[PDB]
Design a protein around this ligand. Structure first.
Ligand SMILES: Nc1ncnc2c1ncn2[C@@H]1O[C@H](COP(=O)(O)OP(=O)(O)O)[C@@H](O)[C@H]1O
Ligand SMILES: [Cl-]
Ligand SMILES: [Mn+2]
Ligand SMILES: [Mn+2]
Length: 555
RNA sequence: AUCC
């Protein structure tokens, strides 16, 4: 049937100059030594990505699909969604959102300047009146940081980002923002993965696991998901949106966004040249996350029925999926997974790596993470979310004139606070750096799901207790997998081994303690793992007082 | 210089 993309041969050009690594990395050169291994993707590789994501989709649905989709529409029909006012939508624009071609930017949008508001009014009017003319988009290469991988070819090509003008982006929110906040939760319930903190994700997976008489679990991820989404998938997404009760004006804008933007359209590079035409998900539109997540769910659940998965419990985040189910014996389990993959493949969601059944929860990786186990203060098993620290360490070492890595250190410290790598390596580095700079009490930003939260370093103990529990400060006897993976990642980036971080941490602890106040609390709680004779850590009063519920939720 |  349809090609994901077609190309005119015009280059995908840089969206500004692309920042230079420097000869000295003064904030991370005591974290690790192999700076040569840390790179950022750029437009120079966009052509290679374009080639890998351009292909012909043929899609073949069946009765399991029809049946799932039907259930999902019923579920959607219970949702009432409203238009956002033009002004509400304006003010949800992020502060550095890329400016309009029409002579205004995010500052103006967010402040509701008259020029910007009037442009947007007219964009909205045109959406209500013209349901057909394709809306032009810009295509750009994503700049992201990774550690080189010789196994997988050295350096990954840049992902492709496709987005419409700022004025349209505002209009998307008027039409769909309220739906983005309600629909996924309504159609998926507990299966919607972007509602859970790391501890909650763990709790849910363990509960799912313990509920089966004889569990089997697997993960799945689609190769290049956005390019595999069909025009028909996208119109099906609309029909799911339209099943909610909406005012008529929303219906009209939603249909018009669908036909003019979401299903496809022409693409221009940053120099304004025609670059290509698209017939798949534009990653960059408002509906990217909701769309990916709902369409993944529909396909996956239909594929579960097709393969005969018994008592499936799912967890879906975009195109990342875990399914925990009742094992039918390893022989049938393996057949069932092949049938799952074949069905997903008919549905136009082929796998990156073929999935495989597992019967031990530590061995399942989804959303770049997995559940592991360690022992707590009282010797009980304690489960928590971890990941390979390779990419976090590489991002910990991205330092340019334009970019400081300190916020990424913080982000990882918060999300992965119970992990051996955060506690021994990143915490030790973070605190050492800030003490020496004398910036310990200076607020930093925590970035998550596109939101930004201001955090003071000296409040970490309370934040961590609240988010992960007091046991995050007393885990020991980490697992073989985790010890092996962390040691290996450190060697690979030329970082000191864990025993050296332990010595460093003793010294960081003592300095923190010597400063008194909140600093000393950080030393006692965050680095109790580092001393010979432990302290008895007690609940922090400030922790009871904190509400962090918005950090890890969409809705 | 995309969206959640
Ligand atoms: N930075 C991003 N901006 C917008 N959308 C994204 C981003 N990262 C991932 N996505 C969306 O989620 C999908 C799945 O991502 P992933 O599994 O990480 O890679 P792939 O695109 O190869 O499947 C993407 O195809 C894209 O539509
Ligand atoms: Cl314990
Ligand atoms: Mn994928
Ligand atoms: Mn994925």
């Amino acid at each position: 049937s349809s090609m994901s993309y077609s190309w005119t041969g015009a280059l995908i050009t840089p969206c500004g100059p692309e920042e230079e690594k420097l000869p000295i990395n003064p904030l991370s050169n005591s974290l690790l030594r192999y700076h040569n291994k840390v790179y950022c993707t750029t437009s120079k590789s966009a052509s290679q990505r374009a080639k890998k994501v351009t292909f012909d989709r043929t899609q073949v649905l069946d009765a399991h699909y029809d049946s799932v989709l039907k259930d999902i529409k019923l579920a959607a029909s219970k949702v009432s969604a409203r238009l956002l006012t033009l002004q509400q939508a304006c003010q949800l624009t992020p502060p550095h959102s890329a400016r309009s071609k029409y002579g205004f930017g995010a500052k103006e949008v967010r402040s509701l300047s008259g020029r910007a508001v009037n442009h947007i009014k007219s964009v909205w009017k045109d959406l209500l009146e013209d349901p057909q003319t394709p809306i032009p988009t810009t295509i750009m290469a994503k700049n992201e940081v990774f550690c080189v991988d010789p196994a997988k070819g050295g350096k990954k090509p840049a992902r492709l980002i496709v987005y419409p003008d700022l004025g349209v982006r505002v209009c998307e929110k008027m039409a769909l923002y309220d739906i983005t906040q309600k629909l996924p939760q309504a159609v998926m319930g507990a299966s919607y993965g972007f509602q859970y903190s790391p501890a909650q994700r763990v709790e849910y997976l363990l509960k799912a696991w313990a509920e089966k008489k004889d569990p089997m679990g697997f993960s799945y991820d689609t190769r290049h998901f956005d390019s595999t989404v069909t025009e028909r998938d996208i119109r099906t997404e609309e029909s799911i949106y339209q099943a909610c009760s909406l005012p008529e004006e929303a219906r009209t804008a939603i249909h018009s966004l669908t036909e003019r933007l979401y299903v496809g359209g022409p693409m221009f590079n940053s120099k304004g040249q025609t670059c290509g035409y698209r017939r798949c998900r534009a990653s960059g539109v408002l509906t990217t996350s909701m769309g990916n997540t709902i369409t993944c769910y529909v396909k996956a659940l239909a594929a579960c029925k097709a393969a005969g998965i018994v008592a499936p419990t799912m967890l879906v985040c975009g195109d990342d999926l875990i399914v925990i189910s009742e094992s039918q014996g390893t022989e049938e389990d393996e057949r069932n997974l092949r049938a799952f993959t074949e069905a997903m493949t008919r549905y136009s969601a082929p796998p990156g790596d073929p999935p495989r059944p597992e019967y031990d929860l530590e061995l399942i990786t989804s959303c770049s993470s997995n559940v592991s186990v360690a022992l707590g203060p009282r010797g009980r098993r304690r489960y928590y979310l971890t990941r390979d620290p390779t990419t976090p360490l590489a991002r910990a070492a991205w330092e340019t004139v334009r970019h400081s890595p300190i916020n990424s250190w913080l982000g990882n410290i918060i999300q992965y606070a119970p992990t051996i790598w955060v506690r021994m390596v990143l915490m030790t580095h973070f605190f050492s750096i800030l003490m020496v700079q004398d910036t310990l009490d200076q607020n930093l930003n925590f970035e998550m799901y596109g939101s930004v939260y201001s955090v003071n370093p000296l409040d970490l103990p309370a934040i961590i207790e609240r988010l992960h529990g007091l046991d995050a400060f007393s885990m020991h006897t980490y697992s073989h997998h985790e010890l092996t993976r962390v040691a290996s990642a450190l060697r690979k980036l030329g970082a000191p081994p864990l025993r050296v971080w332990k010595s460093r941490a003793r010294a960081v602890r003592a300095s923190l303690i010597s400063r008194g106040g909140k600093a000393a609390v950080c030393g006692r709680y965050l680095f109790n793992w580092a001393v010979k004779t432990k302290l008895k850590l007690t609940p922090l009063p400030e922790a009871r007082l904190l509400d962090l519920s918005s950090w890890f939720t969409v809705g």
